Structures are given as C-alpha cells and as structure tokens.
Amino acid sequence: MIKVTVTNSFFEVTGHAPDKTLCASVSLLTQHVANFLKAEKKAKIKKESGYLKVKFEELENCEVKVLAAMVRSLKELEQKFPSQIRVEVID
Amino acid sequence: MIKVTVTNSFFEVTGHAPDKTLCASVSLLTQHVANFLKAEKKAKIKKESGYLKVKFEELENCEVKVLAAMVRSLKELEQKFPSQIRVEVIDNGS
Numbered sequence A: 001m002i003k004v005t006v007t008n009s010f011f012e013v014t015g016h017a018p019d020k021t022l023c024a025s026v027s028l029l030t031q032h033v034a035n036f037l038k039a040e041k042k043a044k045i046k047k048e049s050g051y052l053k054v055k056f057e058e059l060e061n062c063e064v065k066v067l068a069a070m071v072r073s074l075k076e077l078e079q080k081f082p083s084q085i086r087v088e089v090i091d
Numbered sequence B: 001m002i003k004v005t006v007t008n009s010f011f012e013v014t015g016h017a018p019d020k021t022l023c024a025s026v027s028l029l030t031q032h033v034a035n036f037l038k039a040e041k042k043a044k045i046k047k048e049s050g051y052l053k054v055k056f057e058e059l060e061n062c063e064v065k066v067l068a069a070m071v072r073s074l075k076e077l078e079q080k081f082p083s084q085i086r087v088e089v090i091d092n093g094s
Helices: A020-039 A061-080 B020-039 B061-080
Strands: A002-006 A010-014 A043-048 A051-056 A085-089 B002-006 B010-014 B043-048 B051-056 B085-089
Touching: A002 A020, A002 A061, A010 A020, A020 A043, A020 A051, A020 A061, A020 B020, A020 B061, A061 A085, A061 B020, A061 B061, B002 B020, B002 B061, B010 B020, B020 B043, B020 B051, B020 B061, B061 B085
Parallel strands: A002 A085, B002 B085
Antiparallel strands: A002 A010, A010 A051, A043 A051, B002 B010, B010 B051, B043 B051
C-alpha cells in the first residue's frame, strides 16, 4: 500500500502497491513535483529505496498551487485504488 | 505510440503505448498539469477516449515553468521508450 502524507511543511511517499502501473505512475508524479520544487530552490529532498520526503522552503503562490494539484491528482487515484494508495492531507 | 504535441496555445495527447506503465505515467502527469491549469482558470480541457487537449489561457511565469517541466519529463520518457512515445514541440514563425 502506497502512503502519501501531505502537510504545510512537507509531503511524504512510502510503501508500494501491487499494481506496478499505479506504483510507477505515483513515483513519477511525486518525484516530478519534488524535483520541480528542488529545481527552484523551494525544497530539500530525502530519496531512499521506497521512500520520499520533500521539505518545503519559501513556498510562493506557484508552488502552493502545484502541491494542491498534486493532492488533487492523487486523490482521484485513491478513489480508484482505495486499497492500494492512501492520501492523508494534514493541517 | 503516444503522441504529445506542444504549441504556444495548447498541448495535446493521443494514442496509446503497448507498455501499461508508460501509458499510466503519461496519463497521470498530463492530466495533473491539465488539472492544475484548469483550477486557476488558465486552461480549458477537452478530454476524450484516447485524446486529451489542453488549451492555454493567459499563462504567466508560473505555468510556463510548470509546462516546461512537464515537457522536460516527457522528453525524458521519450528517451526511455523511443518507439512508444513521441514529443513534438511545434515551433512556428521565425
């Protein structure tokens, strides 16, 4: 089961899903957003085997809308694969 | 073969790839940018069976960079599955 935790300070991706396409798809999207934030000096990344944690730094209007779209995108998947991915957005 | 077209007015996605992981990665990444753009009213989405077309509207620095990043990533997948996906940026004028 893929676990995605998204807060105001960072987002975290752990675990794996039986579905290799769901698993490859989520790893691509999350790493994409992570690298986009890193590319513009807006985040520091921790990348290990089946683990990703992105720490936000100086987020502006642009990055906050990107993060929100990332949550949107993952929840649609959570709706379609409720037993393989779990999206928890904390306040 | 997945065909991605990028112009100054829109980006389009058509066809499918034999590899299911490639199809899903592309569909998710492209719909993600499309969803991002629509949320802030910067794009209109035409979504069909094996067809996606996103028409831009008043793009600012933010989306230009998000879009450039989407292309960069698709060109990267193009490198990995050369027979399964084609990314065409149509540069017209002079």
